[PDB]
Point group: C2
Chain length 196, copies 2
């Protein structure tokens, strides 16, 4: 059976940028719900004994939706953390200078994409298939692995449940606050894997 990976931090660790209440609902209700539902759906299928990522890559319909959401949510929690945020460091800092000119330029363009997305979905920093960092947006449970558009480096959830408790309709303030939480160590891990 598929399980829900632990958070690498306490439920209140992202506060006040993302509240304990939000993490509680988003992780213990939404994310946990996708795991429970996927297990239900893949019993008696060719997917029952495959990795989550193999299910993401091979499935469609409700199985894909729940599988990709589990995967996207885990990537999102790992894309954040306490005493993170601020300026990038290490290789991802260099790669952002190369591909966007500056971190501030990347930040402005990412915020613009995240705020302009219509409906539920995800913003991504990804390494494209030309070894260049790009910003992608996906709808609903979509992600760049399934789309073959790139290797995920970081993600920000912009489904309304990610922010509605703390920010209501004001997604721009959620995005502004999310920059205090970005885990550049996870981005560097992903960059290295992506470039090998």
């Amino acid at each position: 059976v598929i399980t829900l990976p632990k958070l690498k931090y306490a439920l209140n660790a992202l506060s006040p940028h993302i509240s304990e209440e939000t993490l509680n609902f988003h992780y213990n209700k939404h994310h946990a719900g996708y795991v429970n539902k996927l297990n239900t759906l893949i019993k008696d299928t060719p997917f029952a004994e495959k990795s989550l990522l193999d299910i993401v890559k091979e499935s469609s319909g409700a199985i894909f939706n729940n599988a990709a959401q589990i995967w996207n949510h885990t990537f999102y929690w790992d894309s954040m953390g306490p005493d993170c945020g601020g300026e990038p460091h290490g290789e991802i800092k260099e790669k952002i200078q190369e591909d966007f000119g500056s971190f501030n330029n990347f930040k402005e363009q990412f915020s613009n994409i995240l705020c302009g997305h219509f409906g539920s979905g995800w913003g991504w920093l990804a390494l494209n298939n030309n070894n260049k960092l790009v910003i992608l947006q996906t709808h609903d449970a979509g992600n760049p692995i399934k789309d073959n558009t790139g290797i995920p480096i970081l993600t920000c959830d912009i489904w309304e449940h990610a922010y509605y408790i703390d920010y209501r309709n004001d997604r721009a303030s959620y995005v502004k606050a999310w920059w205090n939480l970005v885990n550049w160590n996870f981005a560097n891990e992903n960059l290295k894997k992506a470039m090998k």
Copy 2:
């Protein structure tokens, strides 16, 4: 310029099934926001002096998303009311019995579709070209007028902002509560025109 149609009732009129705070944000931020955005988008375009429905049918992209959300939201508010809900009455009760066998069959089927819908969207009761009632679901700002899948009779918003303040992740409880609000008089008006 396109304007925001007035609610037929006060912001507290649907409580406690949908809170006054919810209606405040949903109407005065989201719905009003679609109006403001559309107006900026259609300035100096051919859409500038056309009706909302014309824009809904003929547009694409961000103009469509905003136009269709304005129309969908108005249809949603008008699909509810205070001291409404419960068992259907008049022509729509008779039509639901005919097309779904009973109100409870319809209620349960519609609830399953509203609860089952992945992502942002809408549930619809519509009339098809054979004068049969059908249940439809659309994604994001989509609606049956745009799709030619039928004439709208009632709608329920299942975007998370519709319910998150009152119910958080519990969409099922929102849907259950919504049955206490259904405006069967509006359904009857719409059925009559549609037939």
